[PDB]
Design a protein around this ligand. Sequence first.
Ligand SMILES: Nc1ncnc2c1ncn2[C@@H]1O[C@H](CSCC[C@H](N)C(=O)O)[C@@H](O)[C@H]1O
Ligand SMILES: Nc1ncnc2c1ncn2[C@@H]1O[C@H](CSCC[C@H](N)C(=O)O)[C@@H](O)[C@H]1O
Lengths: 239, 240
Amino acid sequence: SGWVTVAGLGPGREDLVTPEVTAALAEATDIVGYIPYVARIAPREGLTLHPTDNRVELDRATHALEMAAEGRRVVVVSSGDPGVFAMASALFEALEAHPEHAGTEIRILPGITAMLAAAAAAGAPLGHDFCAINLSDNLKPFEILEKRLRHAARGDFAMAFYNPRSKSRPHQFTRVLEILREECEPGRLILFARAVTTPEQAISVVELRDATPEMADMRTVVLVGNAATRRVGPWVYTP
Amino acid sequence: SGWVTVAGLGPGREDLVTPEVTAALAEATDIVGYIPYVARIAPREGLTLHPTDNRVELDRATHALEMAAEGRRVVVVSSGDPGVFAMASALFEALEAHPEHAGTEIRILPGITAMLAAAAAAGAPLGHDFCAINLSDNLKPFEILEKRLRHAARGDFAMAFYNPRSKSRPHQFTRVLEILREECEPGRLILFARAVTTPEQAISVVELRDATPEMADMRTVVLVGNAATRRVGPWVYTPR
Ligand SMILES: Nc1ncnc2c1ncn2[C@@H]1O[C@H](CSCC[C@H](N)C(=O)O)[C@@H](O)[C@H]1O
Ligand SMILES: Nc1ncnc2c1ncn2[C@@H]1O[C@H](CSCC[C@H](N)C(=O)O)[C@@H](O)[C@H]1O
């Protein structure tokens, strides 16, 4: 029989793809995924490719499940970790909606997630209790974002922001900063980490009083230290 | 001219070590860490291993820096990712405390963290906003851990617990469940994921109401869902 595997490809560099993930890629008959993820995979004999847009999902996933039934071995690929604001959740949601697909074999395969690759490049800003928050979740009303931000601020968590800029919400990030400037000392360290692990990696470290929305974009993860996070030489860490 | 690399070995299975980390280990003159992690390192002329217990200490990091100054290529190893309640922090602490090693070349190499490896085995429990919390930090007063728990609860963050059963704070995880019952609905899914990616991996999902502390040990990472986090067959996920 066939299967569905949801594999994390890591933040970009090929030497971060686990050998686990590489093996499943060698077994697959089909690769489903967002255009530029699919493009990271060397084309080869017997491997049908199904690129897609970053939206939809659900049928993206139901489709993967329908292909398991015909004996196709399907890898749905994600950047970073598939369980971090990625395709793992859509699959199960698509699974709950279709009881006649329960019983297809499913495997979730972890990856180096963006925040930790960023952390590693900067030093150790996530070395204490930390949280991760999606800033382009359009199914999530803004009142919920604010409740996460404020409770992370007050609980003195280090933060990682995924999808800082939506342009669906043309700013929102502009708003996001305000809340931090309310809830945190102005010295709070802010890391703008863009295209981490790629040839165009650039990391900027800035205090909260000087943080502008323009400093983050589509290819950035924003790390926010807790109260004690500081510098040593070019590094950042949390004592 | 040497360096210090802090390298994550992932949660156990060899096929989860990144090729970048496998390559640093092949370059090391010196490995510092918990020897059972690296017992099968390929032997070769010049390779030396420095056994430590499985704990974060500043003194080994200082020593790592000292060797790098003799020109040694030092890999300091951590399970999982080294920036996650692990040795990368301590290295930067030892560096800040020893300005004489300012300028040392330092590389921090990520790995699969236990939470995301357990999340993977479970399905997608950390699919939404989540936080990571260390429950065996004896360097914090219990006060701060509590402030962290209640705010993660109130922001409706899913959560992961590292080091649930403290050897020297035996009755602490009992407090954490109490706080959780205090701040969350009874049917809040909790997952105990034991020895993830090893042949003795075992995962139990129970409601908070039904959960007891002896469900966790030191081989375990504990995942707490959002309020929405739910069950589909053997799998756990959060809808959007
Ligand atoms: N190589 C990279 N460098 C910096 N940020 C990245 C990145 N890859 C992904 N991101 C962050 O992740 C967002 C996409 S959401 C996908 C996250 C992915 N599943 C993971 O686990 O990492 C981007 O908007 C950006 O904030
Ligand atoms: N294979 C495994 N299975 C389950 N939990 C694990 C694990 N490896 C580490 N852990 C968890 O992590 C704690 C050690 S603290 C070190 C965390 C490590 N740097 C990481 O990034 O994952 C353990 O008490 C346990 O809660």
